[PDB]
C-alpha cells in the first residue's frame, strides 16, 4: 500500500514516561493493507509497530 496526502495532529501530550502522548494521522491509501510505523527520532518512541 502507498499513502498520500498525509497529515498529523496531537490532541494531547504528557511526558508521563508511559505513552502519555497521542497522535492522529490522516491518510489517503491507494489500497487496503498493512503498514509499518516507526519514529524518525530517538526522542520519541511509538508504542505501535
Amino acid at each position: 500500500p502507498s499513502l498520500t496526502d498525509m497529515s498529523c495532529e496531537v490532541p494531547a501530550c504528557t511526558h508521563s514516561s508511559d505513552f502519555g502522548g497521542v497522535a492522529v494521522i490522516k491518510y489517503a491509501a491507494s489500497k487496503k493493507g498493512k503498514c509499518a510505523v516507526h519514529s524518525m527520532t530517538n526522542a520519541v518512541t511509538i508504542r505501535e509497530a
Binding site: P11, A12, V22, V24
Partner: protein, 49 residues
C-alpha cells in the same frame, strides 16, 4: 411594648434571623472558597470528545 424592630427587619446585608436555635440565614457578605476533588472516572479524554 417598646421592643422596636427585630434583627430580621433591621439587619444589614439582607440577613434573615430565626430562633430555636438562634441563627442568621443567607447574609450576603464576602465570599466562600470551594475545593473539589474530581475522580479520574469523571473525565473524558480529548480523543474521546
Amino acid at each position: 411594648k417598646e421592643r422596636g424592630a427585630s434583627l430580621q427587619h433591621t439587619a444589614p446585608f439582607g440577613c434573615q434571623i430565626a430562633t430555636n436555635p438562634v441563627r442568621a440565614v443567607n447574609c450576603a457578605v464576602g465570599n466562600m472558597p470551594i475545593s473539589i476533588d474530581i475522580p479520574e472516572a469523571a473525565f473524558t479524554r480529548v480523543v474521546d470528545a
